[PDB]
Write a protein that binds this ligand. Structure first.
Ligand SMILES: [Mg+2]
Ligand SMILES: [Zn+2]
Ligand SMILES: [Zn+2]
Lengths: 49, 90, 50, 1342, 99
DNA sequence: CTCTGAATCTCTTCCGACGCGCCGCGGGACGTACTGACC
RNA sequence: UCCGCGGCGCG
DNA sequence: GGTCAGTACGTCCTATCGATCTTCGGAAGAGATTCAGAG
């Protein structure tokens, strides 16, 4: 994963039940951005007529 | 707008009867073309019916009386049409 | 960067995350003192000593 | 369309099956492969089942709606819709009869008990391994006699054709057809009258019931043997094309193909005049094939496909969790639904939820299409779909228009109770995560660690109004289980309010005098004053007068800044004392409950939202944080550990010296380690809870600490004493996997590091807990399903039944502790009788009054000790309960409305907390009061003490206010130093008995002689080795001589002149009897005083299983014995561990007799008098015995007390109404003792409602009503015994219920909720209730 | 995942299951119990009949929603017809009375 | 000393939480010859 | 498109 | 009579039971066997 600066404090209910409040700097720095590769297949088949 | 239906429940006395009466009135307003008895205030027929029930303008007895009046008017209109047809034939 | 609720720790009794949070801070702090020392272009001797 | 009033089930005649069929299937082929077209007479035939494509002939000659109804001449396929392939059935004409497996193997065997023939013999006959005799002339053979092949050949040689004998289903059918039902019924009734054996009576009565059911239903017994086999429509067993030209086939197709192959082979063999052996084998194989098709695996090994898995038969299609009832009818997949991960919306109002915009667009697509076509933007539906797909701006505006006041239903699985689904107004949000209001999470049991929630869209106006009026979160602020608030502040909400409402000894701005809360807020936000500053603030509060108008009073109050700022948001009408304290979770919940009770729903909703906002804001401002320094370790901990180690070392040295045993050593070490753990915990808490601060004068003063962990735990936001102990003190002794406690505890805490050994020890408990949760979920779910099934019929159906009967409510007290006050047990219930002011005849509370909070307060003020309330079990309503017997609706406060489904609510309220339940000589008075004795008979000894001559004696403590708050049970022969009505002091102890000794007491003074006390034969007299004194010992029946069995040692009392002593008040001589193994210290003729005792006689599972056993009415392993009738006792003659006891009634002419295994410690003596229900031998009490001896109120009290004991031990609050509802559902069946003038039969089991109505009408006509007893069926048996066969089939044991309903020809009237759910019509509860009433009107008019 | 209308199963005539199949959420028996604890008879009926299995019902509901009429015309669920046919296939005559 | 009933023992059958997601694997089909009906 | 099995994961 | 479509039979492939995956706990009901009491 990534090393993240963490403050332990309640913040206006956005950490109410295990919830996590994340800075926009985390998104801007692409620290948790991940690459996903999907394989899609098109199959040509013999059919009647 | 509406958040709680407690006033309408007090007016009707039962939540289930409230739902039935409000559904009847809202269906009158939605499909039957009836005009609301309270300002619409961009509310939907459900909430308008609830607000009419809150003010006491709509209950089961009132709806039954209104439907009886409408049925009597329809019967009178049919009688007038029959009379006009008879006058045309005569 | 992230704000976490203090209330999870007591009931969950996963105190190891608190200690890590402390040690990581220290782990960062040393780096900061290196980073500034690198930004100031200080001599290799002071960097080696630290 | 064609509305139906009922659903009827019966056996199918062969002609009936032919009437269903549209053609005979006679080819084991599905489709041609050259042309993908069904075969001419196969399982998918077009001319039998219907066209493959709509309104098109198979050959294509006719292909349009204009040829509708035309049957093609070329191929015989009717031109119609393809849907007929979903409906039209077929048939197979079997070359040989085949027995239906359900009516053969489903115990009890219907064929077997109809023919009075054993099941194994019928199996042997059916499967062609033995013959049976049908018709016999003058031959020796008997009808229904089985013959082996050798025996058959011998009989044939001996008698030729004078006797008829056959094999197989043909023989069974011939036997069935040749039985006269009426004649057999008459003969069986005569035999039942003549027979004496109870087992014979049971067999005869069950056979008579079966025969009478066959007679009444109109079914013929021979219909149990199949001659024509129905064929399911092809669309219900589809032949699904796959990739690669393969066809996915249902297992039913394979089963049908096997049956058709065997049938055709048998027909061909019959045509060719095959030998007997070959045709017999083929018939056996056909029978096996049909059995596999009907219910595969019921006999022999189930036939398997190429995957080696058993093939799925029709029974498997109906049965089980994956069957139609539970997978498709009771539950369904629904349109207009979605799901997504939930997050917190802390900005949300209580009635609204954050709904993703994309989810809303997809879910409301049809509404958007309609609104687009209304505004002319889209001419056709295709244009609307293209517009929505492109996601134009006008589409977003339309979507905002359509969701304005359209509620959506949010559901989280598992839906343990009705709060698992709630309605919210959706606010459209960006992102893909649903936003949930924080206050509803507790009701949902939802956290934000990955939870997903499902969203449903109500379509119709009635659905929208039900969501708004019944299911919306603003209506669900009270828990239906207990009435306490369910929408309660938690986590940060509670911590912030607690931090806001705490005071500090010296703080910035202390001593200021404030004009009001606004000035406090100004001072706080300006930084001039702290939240905890003690200040005097002018506060204006309001109180409702007698008329209900708010009267205002203003005063200067000592408070803190934070408390005034919080008072800014409190609604008018509440006192300031509700906020002038440190607010924990309990305080906030109580404040909300007070607000709801005083001001109503809307102020409470606004108050809850404001509380949430304020708590979040001030928790954020506090900056509360957990650091490593907050886990403060006591400085005394190390020395406590050292002292404990020294003590264990001393005990170890003592054990090595041999002074103590291994078990004593283990117990001592455990005790000292527990004491050390308690000391460490006390030191930790004492150090944590207090901090020292310098006050205004410059002096150190102690105050409650602001430590973060202590603030979290004390506030109730999170944590507890045990978890703090584990963090900052030793985490204590751990248990091995077997449950035994390890000798050496885990000395380290979590701030310190556990060793490898300590961590390895803790992992045992960790994994045990995880696995226990895994199993507990399943157990609780099964219990909840059973409860729902038993209680789903019960609905409030009338306002008042007019019952004066009820149950008596008193506070639950055990061992001097008041476990439950009367206020909780009586709040919200209707008085069965008028409550009188204690000590007077004045009426304090009138009859039929709902006891709300004010009435309960009035009851507390007058110190009323017991009330009588109306109960569900005592309601006289037929097929329902009245609103007054049920009482207050716990979720709404007022009396319950008609139509409320109280049974499902009760079942959910009991089952939801199931996963919290665990799964795997001295009496000291504690309070100053007076002593009272009940069920007591007393005598005075020579020492002036008191001896009790009753076994059910109860000791109570009464206060000067008139209340009772102690309860104890006094054993027989116990000695008490205080009389009845005396006063005792706090801590005074009075008790004298030996649990290992059973005493024998004498009434008056005299001299004691011996009778039937002869050495060897009955007794043994000796100078004992233990003490060297004279002693007499009584021998047991397995120890004494055989000739002395009828000689019973006895003691007799004489006066100073030798005259026989008579018991005072009676003519009975003073005689006493000694049981086996009894010892008498006295001799022949020694003197005794009044009230003298001389006798030396030798003398666990709880949790969720306990609740399950209580609700299933399971008998205990060693049940207690209760006196069946009131009378005098006497004994009989014993033999090999059994004794006979006779109770002679005071006036009854018939003495009762009982057999007792003598290993039970018999309590009552031979001369004592007993009352019905008195404990003859101690032990667990069987609920059935309680019901039949003490009554309905007794059994309901017992069940309620036991279940509530379990739940209250675990800490769960469930009102007794729900347990009473379940109990009433358990008492639904009765048995008839005397039929009287009614049509019922003695010994038959009927519904109690039916017999009650019959007796009512008979007494209306003046006839003699039928007498009945009530039966206590367990929840499973009660569910399976319902009159609706559909509900029972949906619950469990589908094959048995269906078979019994088929033979009985039952008719289901669709009265319950489950039946109408299966049918798909409005349930007879809630909004649908009125609808069904209209039905009841119309069927009355018709 | 969200669904308004899509494919339906062949035999049960009910919505498919799973996001990959664009299926609908399962309104299980516990959810039915929850709706029965309320008075939500109409919601329960529309989930049992129109939104799941009634073919004519769902077509008419879709048409009425497009037309602006939020009224339901419930019929017999098809799964009940499947159950009746399966019981009749076992040789048991199960029928509806007074149709 | 024997017979019957009741009690006890043995064997068989039924039930066992809900919801959601992903991957893999499997699942009778095709060909040729002979017979009947229609033109 | 259906069914089944196996394995893994989350609440 | 000749032609086309439909229907019928064979191949894949066997041959020892041996492949085959195989083995819970608790409660209730029915049937079979045994013990005690009465005659
Ligand atoms: Mg969670
Ligand atoms: Zn045709
Ligand atoms: Zn009643």
């Amino acid at each position: 994963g990534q090393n993240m600066r963490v403050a332990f404090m309640p913040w206006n209910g956005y950490n109410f039940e295990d919830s996590i409040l994340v800075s926009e700097r985390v998104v801007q720095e692409d620290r948790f951005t991940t690459i996903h590769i999907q394989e899609l297949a098109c199959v040509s088949r013999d059919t009647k007529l | 707008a509406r958040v709680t239906v407690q006033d309408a429940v007090e007016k009707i006395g039962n939540r289930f009867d409230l739902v039935l009466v409000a559904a009847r009135r809202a269906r009158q307003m939605q499909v039957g073309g009836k005009d609301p008895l309270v300002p619409e205030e961009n509310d939907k027929t459900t909430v308008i019916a609830l607000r009419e029930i809150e003010e006491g303008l709509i209950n089961n007895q009132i709806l039954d009386v209104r439907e009886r009046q409408e049925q009597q008017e329809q019967e009178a209109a049919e009688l007038q049409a029959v009379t006009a047809i008879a006058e045309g034939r005569r | 960067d992230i704000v976490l609720n203090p209330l999870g720790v007591p009931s969950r009794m996963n105190i190891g995350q608190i200690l890590e949070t402390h040690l990581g801070m220290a782990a960062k702090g040393i780096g900061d003192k290196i980073n500034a020392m690198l930004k100031q272009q200080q001599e290799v001797a002071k960097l080696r000593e630290f | 369309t064609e509305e139906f009033d009922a659903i009827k089930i019966a056996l199918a005649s062969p002609d009936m099956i032919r009437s269903w069929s549209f053609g005979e299937v006679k080819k084991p082929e599905t489709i041609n492969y050259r042309t993908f077209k069904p075969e001419r007479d196969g399982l998918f035939c077009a001319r039998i089942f219907g066209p493959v494509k709509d309104y098109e002939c198979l050959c294509g000659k006719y292909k349009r709606l204009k040829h509708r109804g035309v049957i093609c001449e070329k191929c015989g396929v009717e031109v119609t819709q393809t849907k007929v392939r979903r409906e039209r059935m077929g048939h197979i004409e079997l070359a040989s009869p085949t027995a239906h497996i359900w009516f053969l193997k489903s115990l009890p065997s219907r064929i077997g008990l109809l023919l009075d023939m054993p099941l194994r013999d019928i199996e042997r006959v059916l499967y062609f391994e033995s013959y049976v005799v049908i018709e016999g002339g003058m031959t020796n053979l008997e009808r229904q006699q089985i013959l082996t092949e050798e025996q058959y050949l011998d009989a044939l040689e001996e008698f030729g054709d004078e006797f008829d004998a056959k094999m197989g289903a043909e023989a069974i059918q011939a036997l069935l057809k040749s039985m006269d039902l009426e004649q057999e019924c008459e003969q069986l009734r005569e035999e039942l009258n003549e027979t004496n054996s109870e087992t014979k009576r049971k067999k005869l009565t069950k056979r008579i019931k079966l025969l009478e059911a066959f007679v009444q239903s109109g079914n013929k017994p021979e219909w149990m043997i199949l001659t024509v086999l129905p064929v399911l429509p092809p669309d219900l067993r589809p032949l699904v094309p796959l990739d690669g030209g393969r066809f996915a086939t249902s297992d039913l197709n394979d089963l049908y193909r096997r049956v058709i192959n065997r049938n055709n082979r048998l027909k061909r063999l019959l045509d060719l005049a095959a030998p007997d052996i070959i045709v017999r084998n083929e018939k056996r194989m056909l029978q096996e094939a049909v059995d596999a098709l009907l219910d595969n695996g019921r006999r022999g090994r189930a036939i398997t496909g190429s995957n080696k898995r058993p093939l799925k038969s029709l029974a498997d299609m109906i049965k089980g969790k994956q069957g139609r009832f539970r997978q498709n009818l009771l539950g369904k997949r629904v349109d207009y639904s979605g799901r997504s991960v939930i997050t917190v919306g802390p900005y949300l109002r209580l009635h609204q939820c954050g709904l993703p915009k994309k989810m809303a667009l997809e879910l409301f697509k049809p509404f958007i299409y309609g609104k687009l076509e209304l505004r002319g933007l889209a001419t056709t539906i295709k244009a609307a779909k293209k517009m929505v797909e492109r996601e134009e701006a006008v589409v977003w505006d339309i979507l905002d228009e359509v969701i304005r006041e359209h509620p959506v239903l949010l559901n989280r699985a598992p839906t343990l109770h009705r709060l698992g689904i709630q309605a919210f107004e959706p606010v459209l949000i960006e992102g893909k995560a649903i936003q949930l209001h924080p206050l509803v999470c507790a009701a949902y049991n939802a956290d934000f660690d990955g939870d997903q929630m499902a969203v449903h869209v109500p379509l119709t106006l009635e659905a929208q109004l039900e969501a708004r009026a019944l299911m919306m979160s603003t209506n669900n602020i009270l828990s239906p289980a207990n009435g306490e608030p369910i929408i309660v502040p938690s986590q940060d909400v509670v911590l912030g309010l607690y931090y806001m409402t705490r005071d500090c000894v010296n703080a910035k701005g202390e001593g200021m005098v404030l004009t009001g809360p606004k000035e406090a807020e100004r001072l706080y936000r300006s930084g001039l004053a702290s939240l905890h500053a003690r200040v005097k603030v002018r506060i204006t509060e309001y109180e409702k007068d007698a008329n209900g108008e708010l009267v205002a009073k203003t005063s200067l109050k000592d408070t803190t800044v934070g408390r005034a700022i919080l008072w800014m948001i409190v609604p008018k009408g509440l006192p300031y004392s509700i906020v002038n304290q440190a607010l924990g979770k309990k305080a906030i919940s109580k404040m909300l409950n007070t607000c709801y009770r005083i001001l109503g729903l809307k102020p409470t909703v606004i108050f809850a939202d404001q509380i949430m906002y304020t708590g979040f804001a001030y928790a954020a401002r506090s900056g509360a944080s957990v650091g490593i320094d907050d886990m403060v370790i006591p400085e005394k901990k190390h020395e406590i550990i050292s002292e404990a180690e020294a003590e264990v070392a001393e005990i170890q040295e003592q054990f090595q010296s041999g002074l103590v045993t291994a078990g004593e050593r283990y117990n001592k070490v455990i005790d000292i380690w527990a004491a050390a753990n308690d000391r460490v915990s006390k030191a930790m808490m004492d150090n944590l809870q207090t901090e020292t601060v310098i006050n205004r004068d410059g002096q150190e003063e102690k105050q409650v600490s602001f430590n973060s962990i202590y603030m979290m735990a004390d506030s109730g936001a999170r944590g507890s004493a045990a978890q703090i102990r584990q963090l900052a003190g030793m985490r204590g002794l751990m248990a091995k996997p077997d449950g035994s406690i390890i000798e050496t505890p885990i000395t380290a805490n979590f701030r310190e590091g556990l060793n490898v050994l300590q961590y390895f020890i803790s992992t045992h408990g960790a994994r045990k807990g995880l696995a226990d949760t895994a199993l507990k979920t399943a157990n609780s779910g099964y219990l909840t399903r059973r409860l729902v099934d038993v209680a789903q019929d019960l609905v409030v159906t009338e306002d008042d039944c007019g019952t004066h009967e009820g149950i008596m409510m008193t506070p639950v007290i055990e061992g001097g502790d008041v476990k439950e006050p009367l206020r909780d047990r009586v709040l919200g219930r209707v008085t069965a009788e008028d409550v009188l002011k204690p000590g007077t005849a004045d009426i304090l509370v009138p009859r039929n009054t709902l006891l709300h909070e004010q009435w309960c307060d009035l009851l507390e003020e007058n110190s009323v000790d017991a009330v009588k309330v109306r109960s569900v079990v005592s309601c006289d309503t037929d097929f329902g309960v009245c609103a007054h017997c049920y009482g207050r609706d716990l979720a709404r406060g007022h009396i319950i409305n008609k139509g409320e489904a109280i049974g499902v609510i009760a079942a959910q309220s009991i089952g939801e907390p199931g996963t919290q339940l665990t799964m795997r000589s001295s009496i000291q008075v504690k309070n100053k009061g007076s002593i009272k004795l009940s069920n007591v008979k007393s005598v005075v000894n020579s020492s002036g003490k008191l001896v009790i001559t009753s076994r059910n004696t109860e000791l109570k403590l009464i206060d000067e206010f008139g209340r009772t708050k102690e309860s104890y049970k006094v054993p027989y022969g116990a000695v008490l130093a205080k009389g009845d009505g005396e006063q005792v002091a706090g801590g005074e102890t009075v008790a004298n008995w030996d649990p290992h000794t059973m005493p024998v007491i004498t009434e008056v003074s005299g001299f004691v002689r011996f009778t039937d006390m002869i050495d060897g034969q009955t007794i043994t007299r000796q100078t004992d080795e233990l003490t060297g004194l004279s002693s007499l010992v009584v021998l047991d029946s397995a120890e004494r001589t055989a000739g002395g069995k009828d000689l019973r040692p006895a003691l007799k009392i004489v006066d100073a002149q030798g005259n026989d002593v008579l018991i005072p008040g009676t003519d009975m001589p003073a005689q006493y009897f000694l049981p086996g193994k009894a010892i008498v210290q006295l001799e022949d003729g020694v003197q005794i005083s009044s009230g003298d005792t001389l006798a030396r006689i030798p003398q666990i599972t709880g949790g969720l299983p306990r609740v399950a056993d209580l609700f299933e009415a399971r008998r205990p392993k060693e049940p207690a014995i209760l006196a069946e009738i009131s009378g005098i006792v006497s004994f009989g003659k014993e033999t090999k561990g059994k004794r006979r006891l006779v109770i002679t009634p005071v006036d009854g002419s018939d003495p009762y007799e009982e057999m007792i295994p003598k290993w039970r410690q018999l309590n009552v003596f031979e001369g004592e008098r007993v009352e019905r229900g008195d404990v003859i031998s101690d032990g667990p009490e069987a609920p059935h015995d309680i019901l039949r001896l003490r009554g309905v109120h007794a059994v309901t009290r017992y069940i309620v007390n036991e279940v509530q004991d379990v739940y209250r031990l675990q800490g769960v609050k469930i009102n007794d109404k729900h347990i009473e509802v379940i109990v009433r559902q358990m008492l639904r069946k009765a048995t008839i003792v005397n039929a009287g003038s009614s049509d019922f039969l003695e010994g038959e089991q009927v519904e109690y409602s039916r017999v009650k109505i019959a007796n009512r009408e008979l007494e209306a006509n003046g006839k003699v009503g039928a007498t009945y007893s009530r039966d206590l069926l367990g929840i499973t048996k009660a569910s399976l015994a319902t009159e609706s066969f559909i509900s029972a089939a949906s619950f469990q044991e589908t094959t048995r219920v269906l078979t019994e309903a088929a033979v009985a020809g039952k008719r289901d009237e669709l009265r319950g909720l489950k039946e109408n759910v299966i049918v798909g019509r409005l349930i007879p509860a809630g909004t649908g209730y009125a609808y069904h009433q209209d039905r009841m009107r119309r069927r009355a008019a018709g | 995942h969200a669904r308004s209308t899509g494919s339906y199963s062949l035999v049960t005539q009910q919505p498919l299951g799973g996001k990959a199949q664009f299926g609908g959420q399962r309104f299980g028996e516990m959810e039915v119990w929850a709706l029965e604890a309320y008075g939500a008879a109409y919601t329960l009926q529309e989930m049992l009949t129109v939104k799941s299995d009634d073919v004519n019902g769902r077509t008419k509901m879709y048409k009425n929603i497009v037309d602006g009429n939020h009224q339901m015309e419930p019929g017999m669920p098809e799964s009940f017809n499947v159950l009746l046919k399966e019981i009749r296939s076992l040789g048991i005559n199960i029928e509806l009375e007074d149709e």
